[PDB]
Design a protein around this nucleic acid. Structure first.
Lengths: 44, 50, 121, 87, 111
RNA sequence: ACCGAUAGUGAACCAGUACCGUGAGGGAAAGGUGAAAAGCACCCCGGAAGGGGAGUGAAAUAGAACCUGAAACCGUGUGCU
RNA sequence: UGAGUAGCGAAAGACGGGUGAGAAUCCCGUCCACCGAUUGACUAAGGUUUCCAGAGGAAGGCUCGUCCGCUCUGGGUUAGU
């Protein structure tokens, strides 16, 4: 059947990208946690 | 259906009373001088010599 | 038939045509035991016809043999059917039945299947 | 100036290229117009054309730590006169 | 005096090896070399080597003629096993075992 | 009058990582040869792996799957039945 | 333990000659069978070195393997349209 994950490069970076999270107040706070925990990647 | 009880080391070792392979039952060849299978050819050198 | 050889009735008859044809062009093959006991009866019935040499005899043999070219003759190529009438038949004219010999080899790796060697006499 | 790094001396760059087609390995942030000038000042020749292609990093050592090699940029100059770009 | 030989970490499972070891335990050298060459089992081409190389220590390190030898000790022990998985129906998995054994043969001149 | 590798930080071992999730997010396991590498020249069986000798060392049943090495469990021989 | 038990994922292969410690399974040859509005030829998304040559056989491959989309050492993509 048609499973739930249909990959896409343009739509991945327009929703979860770095330049998306830096645009709203609640997004720069998601970077403040992943950076405080020490994550290897910030924005997938 | 599933097993109701475990099986002990005793009851397991009785079942395999008969789980063994037999002797190939071979004879010496009157050329090669080496054990060969009956009614076959000598692998070492092939001479059936019917 | 005699025994089924583990194939569908249309594949069974298509293998007793290509096995009986290599034994004619080679004269010493190596196969499985149960097959060998089946090509004792197909080959030795092609030789019987080849010992007649009518036109109605050739046009019965041709129903079985495949069309293979034997180029190992020193120069010319001779068709398999020509080699059943022109050469194999001449060798076995005096004999009456029993044109084939079977010799067992033993078990074979990977399968435990029994090998044999079956050769025209 | 010295944009080039090291020649490339391999099969397919040895004979069918041997004649007027020399492979160089250049910096990863230059265009092809710059290579048409650095090659003429370093060697004093006349360049016909330049082609360029980029390579992607590979996975390197499966054993132990895993990693990527570098990315490189391979250029190819054709000489309308002269020779002796590498010896 | 007795010469031994070991094959450590063979990949056949241990209770498949044990079916063959029985047929040779107590026989004679030349009889044992022939049984392991006319049997259809899969552990024969490996067990035979462990026996053809116990007789090379029975004559090169010590000094015994290789005709009057018997097989005194023949056993197979366990070895470290490998963990594997095979996915089953409806999103579930099951384990697999790739078992291993040590084989050992001792030949002696009954003295 | 705190812990001693299932303890003490998730983490004594390149761990916020292998991996799991579209994403926010979650989250492990894994220390010890010897005082000193002196880490087994050469010989034999084998395609090799692995062994049997000879050597190093106080010790190789200390041989890198390296201190000690318990129980489940798997075997081989045997005294009474 | 259940136990050397269920399963090994729709389908036609046979023989000869090579290679090799080792061949129902690898390479070459002949015959036979299957698809053919497609199991043929192109390209999008997506994957990201899986492509090629010479070596390798511990693990992975539902068996074997001298072989591989697996392992080692070097290669491979070129635009005024």
């Amino acid at each position: 059947v048609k499973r739930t994950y249909q990959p896409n490069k343009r739509k991945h970076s327009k929703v979860h990208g770095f330049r998306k999270r830096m645009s709203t107040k609640n997004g720069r706070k998601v970077l403040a946690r992943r950076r405080r925990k020490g994550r290897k990647v910030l924005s997938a | 259906a599933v097993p109701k009880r475990r099986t002990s080391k005793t009851r397991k070792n009785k079942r395999r009373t008969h789980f063994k392979i037999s002797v190939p039952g071979m004879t010496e060849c009157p050329n090669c001088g080496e054990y060969k299978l009956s009614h076959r050819v000598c692998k070492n050198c092939g001479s059936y010599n019917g | 038939g005699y025994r089924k050889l583990g194939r569908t009735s249309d594949q069974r008859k298509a293998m007793l045509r290509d096995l009986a044809t290599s034994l004619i062009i080679s004269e010493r093959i190596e196969t499985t035991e149960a097959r060998a006991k089946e090509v004792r009866s197909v080959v030795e019935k092609l030789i019987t016809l080849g010992k007649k040499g009518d036109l109605a005899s050739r046009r019965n043999a041709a129903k079985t043999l495949r069309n293979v070219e034997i180029l190992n003759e020193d120069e010319t190529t001779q068709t398999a059917l020509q080699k059943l009438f022109g050469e194999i038949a001449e060798r076995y004219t005096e004999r009456q039945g029993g044109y084939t010999r079977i010799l067992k080899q033993g078990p074979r790796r990977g399968d435990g299947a029994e090998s044999v060697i079956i050769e025209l006499v | 100036r010295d944009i080039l790094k090291r020649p490339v001396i391999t099969e397919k760059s040895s004979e069918a290229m041997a004649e007027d087609k020399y492979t160089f390995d250049v910096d990863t942030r230059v265009n092809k117009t710059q290579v048409k000038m650095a090659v003429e000042e370093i060697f004093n020749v006349k360049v016909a054309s330049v082609n360029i292609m980029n390579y992607k990093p590979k996975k390197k050592r499966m054993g132990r730590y895993q990693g990527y090699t570098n990315k490189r940029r391979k250029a190819i100059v054709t000489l309308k006169e002269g020779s002796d770009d590498l010896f | 005096m007795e010469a031994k030989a070991v094959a450590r970490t063979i990949r056949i499972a241990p209770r498949k090896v044990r079916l063959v070891l029985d047929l040779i335990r107590g026989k004679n050298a030349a009889e044992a070399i022939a049984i392991l060459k006319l049997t259809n089992k899969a552990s024969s081409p490996v067990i035979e080597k462990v026996l053809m190389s116990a007789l090379a220590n029975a004559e090169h390190n010590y000094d015994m003629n290789t005709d009057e030898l018997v097989v005194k000790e023949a056993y197979a022990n366990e070895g470290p096993t490998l963990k594997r998985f095979r996915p089953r129906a409806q999103g579930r998995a099951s384990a697999i075992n790739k078992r291993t054994s040590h084989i050992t043969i001792v030949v002696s001149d009954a003295k």
